[PDB]
Amino acid sequence: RKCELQGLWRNELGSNMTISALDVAGTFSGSYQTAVTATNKQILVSPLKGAQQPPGTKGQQPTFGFTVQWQFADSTTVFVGQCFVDRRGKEMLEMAWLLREEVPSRKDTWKATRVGTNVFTRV
Amino acid sequence: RKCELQGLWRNELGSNMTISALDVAGTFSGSYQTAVTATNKQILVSPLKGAQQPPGTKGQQPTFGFTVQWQFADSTTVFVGQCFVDRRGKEMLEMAWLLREEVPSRKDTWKATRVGTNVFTRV
Amino acid sequence: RKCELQGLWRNELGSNMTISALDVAGTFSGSYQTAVTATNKQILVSPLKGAQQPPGTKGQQPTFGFTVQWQFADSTTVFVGQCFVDRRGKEMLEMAWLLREEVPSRKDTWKATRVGTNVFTRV
Amino acid sequence: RKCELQGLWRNELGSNMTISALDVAGTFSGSYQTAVTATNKQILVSPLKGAQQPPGTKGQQPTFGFTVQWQFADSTTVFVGQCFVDRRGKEMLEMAWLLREEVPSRKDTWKATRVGTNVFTRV
Ligand SMILES: O=C(O)CCCC[C@H]1[C@H]2NC(=O)N[C@H]2C[S@@]1=O
Ligand SMILES: O=C(O)CCCC[C@H]1[C@H]2NC(=O)N[C@H]2C[S@@]1=O
Ligand SMILES: O=C(O)CCCC[C@H]1[C@H]2NC(=O)N[C@H]2C[S@@]1=O
Ligand SMILES: O=C(O)CCCC[C@H]1[C@H]2NC(=O)N[C@H]2C[S@@]1=O
């Protein structure tokens, strides 16, 4: 089915992710291979956990989000988004994300969160 | 233990959330009772799914995130953050969030995502 | 003059903007013709006001930001970004933005702010 | 003059800012003394430039935004917000911000932008 989250996706940065089938409650797992890191550590495949809303009846794909638990950094990213299918059946996940760094003190919390967007296409 | 995610939390908006114990992989579930909605629907307790990094050894709490699958809206929120413990042992979760609305077309994606911050204290 | 902000730009949504010459302090003015709106109002050209950092000497273009005072809406947008010149000399402004709605009370501030990204190319 | 931007403000991080009188077009200037920095540089007073919407007639203060050109860093911040007067007449600016780092290449743009919120009270 078009825009099913399950499967292999790639974003404009060259990152890849695999999403599992959805459980009955719309929960899913997956793995994320980022192309880029703000750290200087070697990148390792990392697990993700999320949930997607059940589909409506208006020809629109439901919203979803997940958390990436990076295996090589102390940071955590969450992504939230919605899939779209164009005229030609090409699927795209439009996503926004927040990347949270682990900071030394509460006084540094103001600087801890970066934000961005990604677009994923089906591999 | 201080800053253990498991338990009952409340934010400045008056929202409440319960977080489960962490599984071995640092995955957790929970429920979220928001005080506020951008919709005009009646608020219903909603499930959450997330993951937390394992703790370091520097006296700092690890980062974490989760997804809220709202039971009364087509939207999805993700939250990402870090707990802090003050001089007096009062715990606070410092969080940033993105709220994603389900939009009718890809051309409306630009307007689909709101952003904010919350601070949770232990109930 | 590569990556000189002064001039005419268009982003991926079809929005156009004109930036005036920078004054000595790096402040500038301009106009912004958005292709899209979250309102049901007729879009009208709107003024912008901003500032850019002095160029450094390392071959990297300086960061800059601006505010757009929409003439057809009660909201305000801020854009912040940096210009890049590709291998062929083509200029792109990579920007992130926040769109702030005017809300009826303080309790409503939580839902007031949308976030996104745009890329502009020279017209 | 309740919620008149002109004047002196301090936020929860200890930052101070002075906003000049608004000109007829609602544009303004000012200075910003941040208490905190993501750099290891000595903080220096920095100029801001912004704009505010014309007051409506519904008893709600208009949205506004500004850019801060940090004098001690290569980054730029944009703030966007709205003033509120509480039951006792106390004014608070509820603001969200983006802090854009200058990055060495375009490929690095993804990590360039931090986001957060501040609340200002009249000094
Ligand atoms: O560097 C880190 O702290 C962990 C790796 C973060 C990779 C980021 C980057 N990769 C990607 O595919 N989209 C952006 C948003 S994700 O936080
Ligand atoms: O209105 C909706 O679309 C679903 C409910 C969203 C509640 C928001 C609001 N509640 C809260 O505790 N923090 C903020 C961020 S959450 O998206
Ligand atoms: O609808 C409104 O409230 C005012 C118009 C906002 C247009 C938005 C939209 N147009 C554009 O070029 N980029 C995005 C970010 S801007 O806030
Ligand atoms: O360190 C830098 O790059 C420049 C200074 C940035 C200070 C930040 C910090 N100060 C403040 O009052 N609110 C937050 C958001 S502002 O970007």
Author numbering:
A (entry chain B), B (entry chain B), C (entry chain A), D (entry chain A): 2 to 124
What are the paper's exact sentences on this?
Here, we expand the repertoire of known macromolecular biotin binders by reporting a novel biotin-binding protein A (BBP-A) from chicken. In the present study, we show that the chicken BBP-A gene encodes a functional homotetrameric protein. The BBP-A structures consist of four identical subunits, each subunit adopting a β-barrel fold of eight anti-parallel β-strands with an α-helix positioned between the β7- and β8-strands.
We report two different X-ray structures of BBP-A, one in complex with BTN and an other one in complex with D-biotin D-sulfoxide (BSO), at 2.1 Å and 1.75 Å resolution, respectively. Surprisingly, in one of the two BBP-A crystals that were analyzed, BSO was found bound to BBP-A even though only BTN was added in the co-crystallisation experiments. Electron density for the BSO ligand was clearly seen in the difference map of the BBP-A – BSO structure. The only noticeable difference around the ligands in the two BBP-A structures was found at Glu102, which in the BBP-A – BTN structure is hydrogen bonded to the valeric O10A atom of BTN but in the BBP-A – BSO structure was observed either to form a salt bridge with Arg115 (chains B and D) or to hydrogen bond to a structural water molecule (chains A and C). Surprisingly, the affinity of BBP-A for BSO is even higher than the affinity for BTN.
